[PDB]
């Protein structure tokens with residue numbers, strides 16, 4: 120379990136509210152304010168989910184072997200409604216749970232501004248919006264299309280050797296879709312208002 | 314990786330043909346023939362998939378920690394069409410690819426207690442050469458309840474704690490004959506049985 124996690128008194132799940140003005144809070148706030156400087160941040164929480172982390176780190180080590188090194192990880196955004204936050208904190212992102220034009224997977228945005236749309240980060244009865252900062256194993260990617268249930272093969276002659284993720288645009292991606300459970304770790308939860 | 318496996322010389326995947334007369338072949342043949350005595354086995358292959366094994370064993374250790382000294386794993390059957398065998402061997406069981414079962418207890422991957430269920434042509438579709446295909450699968454059934462057709466995840470154990478889930482669902486808790494799982498890496502395809510009429 121990572122150094123920068125704080126002690127969990129022998130528990131396997133906790134949400135840790137970050138201290139404003141310290142290096143970690145500042146780093147996550149800056150990633151958000153790059154595109155959402157007009158929004159008000161109420162708090163940022165570190166998600167310490169030992170089991171999700173374990174499963175994710177196994178998939179990362181596999182993808183690092185499969186892709187023969189390569190930086191396979193990106194930090195992306197995911198807006199969610201308040202009613203889904205408890206499920207995501209405990210279980211992560213589930214493709215079985217908006218437009219799915221690039222495939223039937225879980226969608227992650229490059230820009231917080233995209234995830235900040237009310238269609239994704241639905242304001243709750245108090246006006247509070249929720250967005251995750253997510254470690255995503257995007258790996259080697261290709262353009263997606265409607266109706267994919269997995270990424271396409273890297274070569275149709277070997278139909279089981281797949282891309283890791285798909286995107287809207289390979290040259291200048293703004294969203295990524297992953298189709299498997301172990302490929303996204305929700306690292307921080309931002310609670311904010313318009 | 315398990316010490317019983319063949320040396321794969323740094324490779325991540327192999328199918329190993331078992332020999333009749335070995336305990337390993339004979340136990341699977343007996344488990345199959347208990348309910349499929351009218352069919353004949355062509356061959357039994359051990360599936361050695363390092364990455365699927367690693368991810369499955371992590372989920373088993375997690376369920377063993379979470380559950381109270383429960384036997385979380387059952388050895389179950391899953392009938393497949395020939396076209397799906399290469400994908401399952403490499404990538405396991407994807408709920409997003411699953412057919413609607415004739416009796417639905419949820420939108421997940423189905424596994425049978427009895428080989429006779431998986432041996433139905435609806436599940437183990439005979440290929441162009443009359444070969445039928447069935448996996449023998451380690452499944453993390455964990456703590457289970459009777460399923461229902463609307464489910465896309467297992468139900469909560471307690472309605473006032475919606476995130477604390479059953480591990481799987483079944484058709485009948487007192488006499489389970491099928492299990493449904495809703496997550497990746499909850500089922501490891503261990504053997505492939507090729508068989509004919």
Ligand SMILES: O=c1[nH]c2sccc2c2cc(OCc3ccccc3)ccc12
Nearest residue numbers: 196197198217218220226227228234239
């Ligand atoms: O942050 C997100 N949260 C959620 S919750 C349910 C969906 C999303 C989501 C979807 C996103 O792309 C969708 C799309 C598809 C085709 C063309 C343009 C856009 C992008 C981001 C999100």
